[PDB]
């Protein structure tokens, strides 16, 4: 019952971004469970307190809403839950087992965060209006808040999956990008054929510059790449099918996977009639949008990547996921506090 | 000795952005309009020049350009009380605009010289980069706005084609002109050049030729710069290879937007270096170089509510899209 002092103390501590290589040494063996416990009990309240302090600095008109009070109550409970293990001994295996259950329960509280935050934005539009300045402030915090949420849940999933009894938790060091593209297409195809009476076909063209025709693989979180590519397929298929409804030919959703010296780019092109440039900004705005696209961009940025969209009204749209090719360059992108 | 006084009066007035329709819409009318509007657009940018820090404002290039803008401002003020109905008054006005245009011809290399002076004198810091980028975007855009007025007046009033504006601007014709020019330059230096492929996508009127109302001279400069960088990257990347992949272009006509995508296969670029292609400072150094006329090219696009964007995939190639307003109703001057 001392959360305000806990937030002030740990807000001074800066978050600690981690590279892809560091995640592997932690998950290299089950013997590293103690080192992960001693690190996570310190780092988790730092990331919580930093965003929690940013949450409290919000204006009271936003902070006083029931949606914001609920999420802040979850962060406080999980913060106080993690701080019970600060005084415990890592050499006791029971202390380690209790921490995992705590982390699994911490996630269960924050499962419905994105739908909850979407309610507060809709409440804001109908109570205070949807003006450009309100969008910039809502975009600024939610990107940082969700980027903090992506970073925090990343740390939890690695410990629960590794320390349970080829894939290092949620990270696949031999991640076949084309297979993840095909999997995201297959899920979108299933939804497309149920909603519509057709589905665009898939085309993939890999471009390995240094090793032409060799399969392109990287070190990444495939669950993140699936989330980004899947949200892109749903948009490409919706526009492609609805644009060619009076037409018989259904163009394919062509994809390209280029492996450069630094970038691993993943372009997805449709022919859904495209979008005017005026409305491209609207697709990434939380208030004006239906958050799979901005959240997908955060997954890209989370490891120094990016996700960009460029369209041609009357023809179609192209979307490129930019990922760091090297695991060295793949480092956590956290909100600057 | 009232140059600061003249700047204060007309700087108070905000510039009036004009539409493409207004440009189509007589020398007395343009004479009376420009003698008010020109000193207003000069005063606003000359105001921001003095807002610069002492590091930049004290440079010889800045003070040199100020001498042209000050001298150009004073040239317009003689005609404030003159007679529009006098043909000698109107002719002197038209003659006065040509010298001001020719006076400011060496502004871009002069301003480019000042950036190099700052890079070597104070270093390449992020804060000065954004300020130089923020300032040069507004200064060069003001230069385009002023030249557009001067060219429209001097060319219309000489004593189907409205000066610099082509109401039936076939976009693919301007693309071929810029390509053929860049190809000859590519052939002269590299003794080789990629081939061009053009496609058109008229959504509202299939198979109708894509025409618009635009300034083809501004459109030629943008496409010319893009080909020069696409040809170099395609050539230099395939110097050991035999086949040069072609430079493909598409022209889409939507309900409101007219887009122009250009695509090469010059091995693409990392995402980190895309910023420096549009930066004045990082493109500035002691066919064309990668990112030379590209900052100013993006300004020509935004001058009528357009934009210019680059998207590259390292190991493959690069895409470049020019977004333009299809309708002259939405084509309006973006003024600082
Ligand atoms: C007004 O938004 C739209 O109607 C709209 C939106 C998208 C679209 N096509 C249309 C007509 N393709 C998209 C894509 C594909 C992979 C390249 C991604 C995200 C949104 C869209
Ligand atoms: C260091 O920048 C470069 O070397 C560089 C620059 C460009 C490029 N390819 C490379 C390797 N294509 C370009 C294009 C074409 C139409 C798509 C336009 C402008 C610059 C580039
Ligand atoms: Cl000038």
CA-based nearest residue to B266, from B321, B319, B327: B319
Nearest to A240 by CA among A230, A229, A251, A224: A251
Q: Which two structure tokens, joined as six digits, stand for A35? A: 């080192």
Listed by number, the residues of chain A in 274-333 with a beta carbon closer than 8 Å to a beta carbon of chain B are: 274, 276-278, 306, 308, 310-315, 318, 320, 322, 325
Centre a 10 Å sphere on the Cβ of residue B289 and count the other Cβ atoms it contains.
12
**Residue B267 assigned as binding residue:** no
For the domain made up of A172-329, give the CATH fold: Heat Shock Protein 90 (3.30.565)
Angle subtended at Cα B37 by Cα B33 and Cα B40, rounded to the nearest 5 degrees: 160
User: Rounded CA gap, A27 and B164, in Å?
Assistant: 66
Angstrom distance (rounded) from CA A307 to CA A109: 29
Tokens of residue B161, six digits: 């084609």
Sequential DSSP letters for A170-209: TBEEEEEHHHHHHHHHHHHHHHHHHHSS--PPEEEEEEES
Q: Is A20 within 8 Å of A219 (Cβ atoms)?
A: yes
Mutate to test the pocket of ligand 2, among B269, B276, B291, B296 (most ligand atoms within 8 A of CB): B269
Give dist(CA A164, CA B300) in Å, integer: 60
Structure tokens at A218: 């990287």
Specify whether the CB–CB gap between A216 and A259 falls below 8 A: yes
Decide: B266 in ligand 2 pocket, CB within 6 A.
Answer: yes
Q: Is B173 on the interface with A (CB under 8 A)?
A: no
Question: Which secondary-structure segment (H or E) carries A312?
Answer: strand A306-312
Q: In sequence order, which residues have a C-beta less than 8 Å from that of residue A246 and are 6 or more positions away? A: none
Separation CA A116–CA B32 (nearest Å): 60
What's the Cα-to-Cα distance from B21 to each of A313, B142, B331, rounded to whole Å?
Answer: 23, 20, 8
Q: How many CB atoms lie within 10 A of CB B20?
A: 23
Q: Does domain B166-330 have CATH number 3.65.10.10?
A: no
Measured CA to CA in angstroms, residue A66 lies from A113, A123, A233 at distances of 13, 10, 35
Copy the structure tokens of residue A90.
């890592």
Determine whether B228 is an active site residue. yes
Q: Do A3-162 and A172-329 have matching folds?
A: no
Alpha-carbon dihedral of residues B255, B260, B261, B264, nearest 10 degrees?
Answer: 160
Angle formed by the axes of helices A292-301 and A222-243, to 10°? 140
As a whole number of angstroms, the distance between CA A292 and CA B237 comes to: 37
B311/A322 CB distance under 8 A = no
Enter the tokens of residue B133: 């980028």
Which ligand sits nearest to residue A229's alpha carbon? 1
Query: Using CA positions, which residue lies closest to atom 14 of ligand 2?
Result: B230
Question: What are the CA-CA distances from residue B236 to residues A91, A235, B186, B240, B288 (Å)?
Answer: 61, 37, 11, 8, 13
Fold of B3-156: Butyryl-CoA Dehydrogenase, subunit A; domain 3 (1.20.140)
What are the distances in angstroms from CA B259 to CA A91, A311, A313, A316?
64, 9, 7, 11
| Tokens of residue B10, six digits | 């007309």
Catalytic residue numbers of A, as ranges? 227, 231, 234-235
User: Cβ atoms within 10 A of the Cβ of A326, count?
Assistant: 15
Confirm or reject contact between B267 and chain A (CB < 8 A): yes
| 3-state secondary structure at position B55 | helix
Spacing, Cα B230 to ligand 2 middle (Å):
6
Q: Which of A207, A210, A322 has the CB atom closest to B316's CB atom?
A: A207
Residues of B in contact with A322 (CB under 8 A): 271
Q: How far apart are CA A65 and CA A125, in angstroms?
A: 13
Contact B207, B285 (CB under 8 A): no
Is there a contact between B172 and B221 (Cβ–Cβ < 8 Å)? no
Break chain A into its structural domains and give their ranges: 3-162, 172-329
Q: Give B-chain residues touching A262 at CB under 8 angstroms.
A: 270-272, 314
Structure tokens at B220: 């030629």
Q: Is B163 annotated as a binding residue?
A: no
Classify residue A215 by its DSSP letter. Answer: P
Give dist(CA B303, CA B312) in Å, integer.
Answer: 25
d(CA B138, CA B295) in angstroms, rounded, equals 12
Tell me the HSE value of A168 on the side-chain side, using a 13 A CA sphere: 22
Q: Is B287 annotated as a binding residue?
A: no
Minimum-distance ligand 2 atom for the alpha carbon of B263:
17
* CB of A267 less than 8 A from some CB of B: yes
Name which of B203, B332, B230 is nearest A311 in CA terms: B203
Q: What does the DSSP 8-state code read for residue A115? A: H
Q: What residues pair up with B310 in beta bridges, in sequence order?
A: B320
Q: Note whether B314 contacts A267, CB cutoff 8 Å.
A: no
Q: How far is CA A40 from the centre of its chain?
A: 20
Tell how far CA A249 is from the center of its chain. 35
Q: Whose CA is nearest to atom 21 of ligand 1?
A: A235
Q: Is the distance from CB of B203 to CB of A314 less than 8 angstroms?
A: yes
Instruction: Out of 1.10.340.30, 1.20.140.20, 2.40.50.1070, 3.30.200.20, select the CATH number for domain A3-162.
Output: 1.20.140.20
Find which of A272, A313, A317 to mutate to test the B interface (most B CBs within 10 Å of its CB): A313
Structure resolution, Å: 2.2
Largest distance between two CA atoms of chain B: 68
Q: Is B183 a catalytic residue?
A: no
Q: What is the DSSP letter of A267?
A: E
The answer to whether B211 and B328 are in contact (CB under 8 A) is no
Residue A30 per-residue DSSP state: G
Q: Which positions in chain A touch B313 (Cβ < 8 Å)?
A: 207, 256, 258, 260, 263, 265, 267, 320
Q: Which ligand neighbours the alpha carbon of A269 most closely?
A: 1
Residue A60 to chain B, least CA–CA distance (Å): 33
Method: X-ray
Ligand with minimal distance to B245 CA = 2
Residue A81 CA to residue A105 CA, distance in Å, equals 10
Q: Which residue has the tokens 């996508």?
A: B201
Cβ count near A38 (within 10 Å): 13
User: What are the residues whose beta carbons fall under 8 Å from the beta carbon of B99, sequence distance 6 or more?
Assistant: B75
B225 alpha carbon to ligand 2 midpoint, in Å? 10
- The helix, strand and coil proportions of chain A, stated in percent and rounded to the nearest 5, come to 55, 15, 30
Distances (CA, A) of B19 to B24, B327, B336: 9, 11, 15
Could B314 and A273 be called an inter-chain contact, meaning their C-beta atoms sit closer than 8 Å? no
CB of B116 closer than 8 Å to CB of B80? no
**B270–A258: do the CB atoms touch at under 8 Å?**
no
The answer to whether B313 contacts A258, with C-beta atoms less than 8 Å apart, is: yes
Distance from CA of B259 to the nearest CA of A (A): 6
Instruction: Kindly tell me the sign of the dihedral angle through the C-alpha atoms of B101, B104, B106, B111.
Output: negative
| Number of alpha carbons in the 13 Å side-chain half-sphere of residue A169 | 25
CA A39, A42, A48, A50 dihedral sign is negative
d(CA B310, CA B319): 6
Output phi, psi for B316, to 5 deg: -125, -80
Residue B115 CA to residue B104 CA, distance in Å, equals 18
In the DSSP assignment, the letter for residue B251 is E
Strand partners, A203: A254
Q: Are A4 and A316 in contact (CB under 8 A)?
A: no
CA gap A151, A18 in Å, rounded: 10
Q: Annotated binding residue at B187? A: no
In angstroms, rounded to a whole number, what is the distance separating the alpha carbons of residues B31 and B84?
A: 7
């Amino acid at each position: 019952g001392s959360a305000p002092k806990y937030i002030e103390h740990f807000s001074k501590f800066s978050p600690s971004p981690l590279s892809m290589k560091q995640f592997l040494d932690f998950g290299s063996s089950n013997a590293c469970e103690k080192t992960s416990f001693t690190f996570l009990r310190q780092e988790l309240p730092v990331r919580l307190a930093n965003i929690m302090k940013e949450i409290n600095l919000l204006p009271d008109r936003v902070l006083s809403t029931p949606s914001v009070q609920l999420v802040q109550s979850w962060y406080v409970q999980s913060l106080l839950d993690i701080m019970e293990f600060l005084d415990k001994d890592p050499e006791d295996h029971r202390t380690l087992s209790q921490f995992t259950d705590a982390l699994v329960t911490i996630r269960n509280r924050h499962n419905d965060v994105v739908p909850t935050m979407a309610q507060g934005v809709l409440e804001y539009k109908d109570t205070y209006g949807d003006d450009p300045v309100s969008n910039q402030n809502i975009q600024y915090f939610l990107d940082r808040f969700y980027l903090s949420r992506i970073s925090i849940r990343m740390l939890i999933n690695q410990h629960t999956l590794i320390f349970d009894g080829k894939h290092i938790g949620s990270i696949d060091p031999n991640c076949n990008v084309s297979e993840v593209v095909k999997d995201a297409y297959d899920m979108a195809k299933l939804l497309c054929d149920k909603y519509y009476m057709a589905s665009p076909d898939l085309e993939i063209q890999e471009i390995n510059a240094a090793n032409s025709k060799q399969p392109i693989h990287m070190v990444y979180v495939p669950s993140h790449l699936y989330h980004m590519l899947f949200e892109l397929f749903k948009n490409a298929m919706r526009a492609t099918v609805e644009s060619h409804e009076s037409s018989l030919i259904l163009p394919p959703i062509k994809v390209m996977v280029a492996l450069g010296e630094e970038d691993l780019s993943i372009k997805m092109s449709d022919r859904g009639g495209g979008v005017p440039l005026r409305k491209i900004e609207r697709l990434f705005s939380y208030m004006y949008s239906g958050y799979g696209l901005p959240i997908s961009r955060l997954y890209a940025k989370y490891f120094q990547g990016d996700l960009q969209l460029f369209s041609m009204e009357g023809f179609g749209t192209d979307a490129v996921i930019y990922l760091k090719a090297l695991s060295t360059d793949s480092v956590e992108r956290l909100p600057v506090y």
